[PDB]
């Protein structure tokens, strides 16, 4: 009985050189749950990130708005359009998009999330064309 089509064999050859008494409490250790964070919004005069939307952020805004226009139907465009993509794009260009860009720069160990909330209607818009 020639079987053939063997499952081979697999070999790993390397080493991972990853460079007060105590007992078992259940509350001092463990706690897989992470502490709830508090949102610190950096004041509008202390924001040091770009006031021009990146192509990534502008694309994300347009995509989110287009999806929400696919589920909803409300908009502020005087010129009506037949596609949610067009409506969202013109909403971004006309500076009437109902979305905010939150840029997170910190995770403080005290459970503090420091963010900069940027208004796309006041921001510069990249090429996108």
């Amino acid at each position: 009985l020639i079987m053939d089509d063997l499952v081979e064999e697999y070999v790993e050859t390397e080493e991972e050189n990853l460079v007060e008494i105590v007992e078992s409490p259940s509350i001092c250790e463990g706690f897989v749950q992470a502490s709830s964070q508090t949102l610190v919004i950096i004041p509008d005069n202390e924001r040091i990130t770009s006031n021009v939307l990146t192509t990534f952020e502008a694309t994300r805004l347009v995509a989110v708005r287009a999806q929400q226009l696919a589920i909803n139907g409300s908009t502020m465009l005087k010129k009506k359009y037949s596609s949610p993509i067009d409506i969202a794009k013109q909403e971004l260009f006309n500076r009437k998009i109902p979305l905010l860009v939150m840029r997170c720069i910190k995770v403080t160990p005290e459970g503090q999330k420091i963010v900069e909330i940027w208004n796309p209607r006041e921001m510069g818009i990249p090429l996108l064309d």
Partner: protein, 64 residues
């Protein structure tokens, strides 16, 4: 399988015996040897293995 040699006298370190020996170990030894408290040597002997969910063994070969 493990083999315990006492100056030429050998006796098989069966998993139950190893389990008792590891249960004899305190947390201070584990911590002071760097191992995490969740990595206590007692956990290395299993009396109730996990039968994996049928999601990872579908079709009715590992089930054999």
């Amino acid at each position: 399988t493990f083999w315990a040699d006492q100056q030429g006298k050998i006796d098989k370190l069966y998993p139950q015996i190893i389990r008792e020996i590891f249960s004899r170990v305190t947390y201070d030894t584990v911590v002071k040897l760097g191992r995490s408290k969740n990595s206590h040597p007692e956990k290395l002997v299993l009396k109730a293995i996990q039968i994996p969910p049928i999601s990872i063994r579908p079709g009715i070969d590992i089930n054999n």
